[PDB]
């Protein structure tokens, strides 16, 4: 940086600060990721200086020409990238993405069928305390008690019962494949749409690691940070049929002018994502995800399903007798960053939970591989089971010291 | 840039282009402007990395400690800036503040007194296409037909007769200032709570030459990039008695992880404003603004309201049998870019309308003065009135570029 530094010392201190922690710990926060440089010179572009409310060739102001392109990029390589046949890529997050599908299809008081909440549905999914369960009537399906599998004759029962005009399906904590055909199947028996928020899987589904959703869900919302390692921002993919109207929903709908230079730093993002080594990188989330679990478990430790298809895995504390909370603020003391997570059918409230929700998405963009996905569980062993030793958590520190360099 | 060039030269491209068109063009759009580059490189940072739900010292994600420390410069930087009880600068828009404060105050259903759309209003201030109108039941107060001024007693009349929840004050086209306290003592007078829009005219409140909303709202909000020149994104200021339901609107309310890298930029922003040269800046916005008013006038034009209170103008075009989206045209045919914007009691629809919206903020930002305002004038005035002439319309491209170098 050259001008923050002298202009503003404390801001600048503050994020220099920010820069060394993402470097020295082991930031396990499945929903996290690193961006590259080019996602970052993006947005901190002059694309910030433009108002561009209104889509490529259709704005409201002049001007735009420009922008329109970057905006065209973007949404064409989400295009290449998923297939879908419309993209929206002005969402301001996943939550603004979910909502603008939710001010489409629904009415005030609809019914909407979402997974259980404390089974790995998302805030945005029903929460009482959240928008969509403030506006809609939200039931949920839950996950087999024993398997963790998502039970799909439950989605198929609830849909029949509560007769839902919409259907949600994914999750912020489910480490599993999630059957986009079967909740399809499952909508049209009931006549609802299908929703699919894709947020936490986006860049398995870009890479051909997890069945993509697009062509099962008439809606299909997305954060572009997660796995698909954009800048922090939304994104709506839909069929054409209903192009008009989402496009319609985000904007004169939900929001007002769009982040141009977010909207830059998404098409650059998607422009590695159409890279091979984006897929290479992927596969390695994938396998280091399940290499940690299966480390995990070599340590004692019982995994949620039993272990994971994709990059997150939750850890059922119980057989370890610790508060999900409590294995979170251990692991912070040694410099390993993790979520508490409420787990299926979990005996503690959700802010003290039985688990803690890991994934591998950011170690993997620093290069870690299945080697320091072994030491990192380890590690975890180490300190999960001698929580008030003093020298295992020294020692873990330095272990985490070696990974971080 | 280093890496953009190399990584994505379409993005890089575009952007490149967007730049030397910023540079190259006479931006009248009155809500732009062009950020600095210490904000700039506040949202190009790591930042953008972190998971950051909840608030400083009330985070859902470990890790937190350096982007608190950004958040809460915002927020003290915004609280000395306006003198507010409690900001939120988590908004990711103008819009999205409007709509927290909208999901804080309202049910669904409940009525809401607004500024009439055509006469000045926001689409987030009752549009029927927009959310604010389509949840809530908005009904409009207007300017005098003579003065163009903000009819008190017509606002007045409207709460007493429906007797709204919520009163709305502010506009995305009122050239003249506000009187807060006169909003305030009517929405007391019908127990309704007030909230201030200052997005336009923020910048000019936080150097003194706007009537500071805070100590007559309980709500103001406002965009982070207008005349306050910071990033591009929303805040929300409020008495503390309304804190913590703001702050839950925001979150778990109606957004999901903050845009930190934004915030930073905020905090950024927020300390240029606090400088004196920031002061001299907005002085010279609205210096400007009043200059090229009366050159506008002295070329034969008339202007909504007769002239300006602050860093906007409407010109009326019917005098020079003149459409907005024809004016706007044959502007953009020279370099020069307004918007069509429909002036109060306008007998054209609002994609046509009667008038051109100008500001002068984004000019001020680049050195341009009086002697500049005078010259602009003179250029519109050749261009307006000699629409079908091509060789006006040469010459003013050629002064044009002489103001631009
Ligand atoms: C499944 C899912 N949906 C939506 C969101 C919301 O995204 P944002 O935090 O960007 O609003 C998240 C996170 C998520 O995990
Ligand atoms: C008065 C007013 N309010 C709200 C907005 C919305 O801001 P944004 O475009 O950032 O959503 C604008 C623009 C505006 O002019």
Do not use: W
């Not at 002005?90 to 069928?113: K, R």
Request: hydrophobic letters at 40%; charged letters at 20%; aromatic letters at 8%.
């Amino acid at each position: 940086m050259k001008y923050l530094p002298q202009q503003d010392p404390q801001v600048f201190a503050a994020i220099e600060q920010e820069r060394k922690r993402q470097h020295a710990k082991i930031e396990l926060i499945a929903s996290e990721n690193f961006v590259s440089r080019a996602v970052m010179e993006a947005q901190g572009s002059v694309l910030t200086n433009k108002y561009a409310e209104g889509y490529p060739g259709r704005r409201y102001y002049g001007g735009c020409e420009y922008v329109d392109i970057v905006e065209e990029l973007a949404r064409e390589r989400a295009k290449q990238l998923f297939g879908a046949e419309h993209a929206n890529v002005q969402p301001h997050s996943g939550a603004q993405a979910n909502m603008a599908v939710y001010f489409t299809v629904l009415e005030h008081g609809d019914t909407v069928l979402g997974m259980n909440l404390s089974h790995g549905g998302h805030l945005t999914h029903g929460s009482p305390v959240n928008f969509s369960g403030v506006q809609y009537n939200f039931v949920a399906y839950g996950v087999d008690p024993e398997t963790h599998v998502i039970d799909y004759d439950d989605v198929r029962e609830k849909a029949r019962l509560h007769r839902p005009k919409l259907i949600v399906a994914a999750a912020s904590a489910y480490p599993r494949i999630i059957d986009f055909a079967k909740f399809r199947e499952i909508a049209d028996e009931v006549g609802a749409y299908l929703m699919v928020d894709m947020a936490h899987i986006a860049g398995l589904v870009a890479a051909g690691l997890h069945p993509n959703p697009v062509p099962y869900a008439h809606f299909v919302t997305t954060t572009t940070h997660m796995t698909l390692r954009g800048p922090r921002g939304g994104m709506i993919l839909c069929q054409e049929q209903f192009a008009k109207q989402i496009d319609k929903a985000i904007f004169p709908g939900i929001q007002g002018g769009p982040l141009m230079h977010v909207i830059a730093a998404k098409a650059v993002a998607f422009g590695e994502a159409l890279q091979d080594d984006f897929k290479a990188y992927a596969k390695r989330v994938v396998d280091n995800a399940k290499r940690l679990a299966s480390a995990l478990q070599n340590e004692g430790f019982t995994l949620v399903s039993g272990g994971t298809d994709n990059h997150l895995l939750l850890v059922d504390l119980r057989p370890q007798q610790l508060t999900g909370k409590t294995a979170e603020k251990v692991l912070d003391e040694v410099g390993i960053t993790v979520n508490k997570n409420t787990i299926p059918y979990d005996p503690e409230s959700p802010f003290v939970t039985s688990g803690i929700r890991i994934g591998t998405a950011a170690v993997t963009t620093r290069g870690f591989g299945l080697e320091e996905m072994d030491e990192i569980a380890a590690i975890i062993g180490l300190v999960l089971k001698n929580v008030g030793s003093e020298q295992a958590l020294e020692e873990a520190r330095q272990r985490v010291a070696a990974l971080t360099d």
